[PDB]
């Protein structure tokens with residue numbers, strides 16, 4: 300895992316739960332880095348899993364909801380760091396169907412040591428998209444938060460249903476349906 304994921308996450312923990320919680324989940328965790336990360340650094344995901352599990356136990360917020368909130372926050376990091384890559388797309392469904400064969404291809408050029416999930420499109424229309432998410436890190440809700448903000452970026456919204464094919468969240472079917480445009484709301 301790249302260090303930018305660690306630094307932005309602990310920034311969000313400090314922003315939402317306080318600096319003492321940042322020190323707490325770091326103290327409860329070991330952690331070859333010992334809690335010191337750099338943006339271009341490469342660290343084991345087991346470090347992040349410890350940080351998430353300890354934060355969830357301390358705050359009583361599920362890892363699902365913590366990763367969802369973080370995934371939504373990380374879209375703003377994408378907005379401010381790669382606006383040209385984001386400006387390539389004009390439709391949220393087309394962008395999400397382009398994560399595997401374009402977006403994360405560019406990410407591997409940024410970070411050659413990147414450890415990324417796989418997204419496989421099984422069905423796609425103009426307002427629907429079904430993809431299979433596969434990753435040993437089971438960060439489906441991190442991707443869900445990024446998907447939520449992808450639709451928000453294009454002034455849209457979507458119902459996104461997650462079906463865990465493997466119970467540990469390492470294979471998840473995403474059923475994305477752009478919402479009814481309630482034009483008379």
Ligand code: HEM
Nearest residue numbers: 300301304377406413414415416434436438441442445446
């Ligand atoms: C242009 C926009 C995007 C940029 C710049 C980007 C860059 C990354 C980076 C840097 C990482 C961390 C890699 C590592 O730690 O080695 C990453 C991991 C991830 N990204 Fe992308 N990403 C982008 C669009 C998406 C979108 C839209 C989704 C939602 C489906 C997405 C779902 C993920 C997930 C779920 C992970 C966690 C790793 C895993 O699941 O195994 N990304 N991305």
